[PDB]
């Protein structure tokens, strides 16, 4: 897996984010090499930090931490603090629909 040197959303490299007009780093998917500028990915600084501590997956590869599939990807929640994916039906207890408010995962809650 060689990381891409351009952003999937804006097509700029690390020397130019074409949406902000400034240089910006790229983060890259561990599975397929797709890359993006954190701001194009809509990441907070703290989320950018977090995705640097584990094998982050792009929006297309994202698989549920609990069962390991990226199937039923309409049922995946992305944690608001670390971007890990979880099926609503894999959570214990399961939820029928996305919570109205912000939602973060059990791992983030335990940090703390």
């Amino acid at each position: 897996v060689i990381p891409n040197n351009y952003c999937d959303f804006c097509l700029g490299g690390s020397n130019m984010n074409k949406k902000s007009g400034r240089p910006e780093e790229l983060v890259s998917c561990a599975d397929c090499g797709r890359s993006g500028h954190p701001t194009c990915l809509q990441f907070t600084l703290n989320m950018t930090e977090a995705v640097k501590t584990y094998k982050w997956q792009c929006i297309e590869c994202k698989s549920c931490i609990l069962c390991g599939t990226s199937e039923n990807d309409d049922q995946l929640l992305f944690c608001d603090d670390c971007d890990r994916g979880y099926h609503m039906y894999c959570l214990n207890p399961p939820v029928a629909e996305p919570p109205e408010g912000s939602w973060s995962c059990h791992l983030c809650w335990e940090l703390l």
Partner: peptide, 17 residues
Amino acid sequence: ARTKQTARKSTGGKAPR
């Protein structure tokens, strides 16, 4: 809460491979 669908809408489309 964020899902794959809200994430895709939030960021816009991705370049092809």
